[PDB]
Structure 1
């Protein structure tokens, strides 16, 4: 977050995360209204944080070797269509799938 002059990546703090979870319980998916309550956040930032990190359906367990194996197979099947591929991974979104491909492609020496 904020500085280092202003960081070009502003990370959500644990407190903002708590805030966001409350705002969603209160306003649902009205991202503009939600973001109005965050002085340094816009609608896009709140939506992304919720959808990919805070939503109760998101997995916070490490990637398993079975999941990795599925990813290599699904990418042979679908190519770089991350949103489609993420359908097959309960608790993971396209954001997670495309990050994981970088890491997997490293292990495979690609």
Structure 2
């Protein structure tokens, strides 16, 4: 039920975006196998240049716990304070932290 992007697909996605910008319908059609939502999500949350791939710092965790006390579970709002992370990363991180904290 999960069709995860392979490194090959990611590179193609990159090229397609370099070529067609933000025309997701058109970028998707370059795949036999992928829709607009899938490419849009993959770019926006994983491949865009601004996305951070470095592990969460202690200070980021601290900011997350602070921001949750402040905003509740409004992940997109909270993600504004994390330069290279999106709501996806912020909410995943909280599931993991709260788990290790004893939910």
- TM bucket, shorter chain: over 0.9
Measure, in 1, the Cα distance between the counterparts of 2:101 and 2:9. Answer: 37
Q: Deviations over 1:5-47 (max 9, x none)?
A: xxx1011000000000000010000000000000010000000
SS of corresponding position for 1:60: coil
Question: Bigger CA drift: 14-23 or 100-109?
Answer: 100-109
Measure, in 1, the Cα distance between the counterparts of 2:50 and 2:15. Answer: 16
TM-score of the superposition, structure 1-length normalised? 0.92
How far did 1:107 drift?
A: 2.1
Question: Could you list the runs of 5+ residues in structure 2 that have no partner in the other structure?
Answer: none
TM-score of the superposition, structure 2-length normalised? 0.98
Q: For residues 10-89 of structure 1, what are the structure 2 equivalents within 5 Å? A: 10-89=3-82
Measure, in 2, the Cα distance between the counterparts of 1:15 and 1:36. Answer: 16
Measure, in 2, the Cα distance between the counterparts of 1:81 and 1:44. Answer: 22
Question: Could you list the runs of 5+ residues in structure 1 that have no partner in the other structure?
Answer: 1-7
Measure, in 2, the Cα distance between the counterparts of 1:44 and 1:91. Answer: 21
C-alpha RMSD of the superposition: 0.5
Measure, in 2, the Cα distance between the counterparts of 1:108 and 1:66. Answer: 17
Measure, in 1, the Cα distance between the counterparts of 2:97 and 2:64. Answer: 9
Q: Deviations over 1:44-96 (max 9, x none)?
A: 00000000000000000001111001000000000000000000001000000
4+ residue runs over 6 A deviation: none
